[PDB]
Design a protein around this ligand. Structure first.
Ligand code: ZN
Ligand code: ZN
Lengths: 53, 103
């Protein structure tokens, strides 16, 4: 499913209008910055629960 | 436990050991005759790249231009588009040398 981005990133502590949660590594959360820089693929599932707009 | 189920890897195909992840290959080639080959870290606005090249040579704010793909982009953003993996190529145009030549 697809929803808002109400979440945070534990790699830089700077959530950004987006959040990808890697399963294989579990309890692992990445933002648009760390994800682009680190290059951590792993079938991530976008998790959100806020208002999109 | 073994490197490969078959037996062993040729190692020939894989030469050297580089991350080739954090860093990317960004270069420029103006019409005049410029050839630069180097890698820059991808964690800051592309500005921290052309700024060194531009300052050490010339500023785009006149003749020199940086075309990321098929348009013009600002140097105050990073997540706007960039998102390069490794092979990052930027085209530039030089109307004038800015020196030596009268025009
Ligand atoms: Zn982050
Ligand atoms: Zn992972």
């Amino acid at each position: 499913g697809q929803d808002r981005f109400v979440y945070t990133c534990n790699e830089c502590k700077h959530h950004v209008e987006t959040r990808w949660h890697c399963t294989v590594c579990e309890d692992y959360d990445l933002c648009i910055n760390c994800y682009n820089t680190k290059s951590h693929a792993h079938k991530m599932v976008k998790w959100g629960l806020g208002l999109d707009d | 436990g073994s490197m490969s189920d078959q037996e062993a890897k040729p190692s020939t195909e894989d030469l050297g050991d580089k991350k080739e992840g954090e860093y990317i290959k960004l270069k420029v080639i103006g019409q005049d005759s410029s050839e630069i080959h180097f890698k820059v870290k991808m964690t800051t606005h592309l500005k921290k790249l052309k700024e060194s090249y531009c300052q050490r040579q010339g500023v785009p704010m006149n003749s020199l231009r940086f075309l990321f793909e098929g348009q013009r982009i600002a140097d105050n953003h990073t997540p706007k588009e960039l998102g390069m993996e490794e092979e990052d190529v930027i085209e530039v145009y030089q109307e004038q040398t800015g020196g030596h030549s009268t025009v």
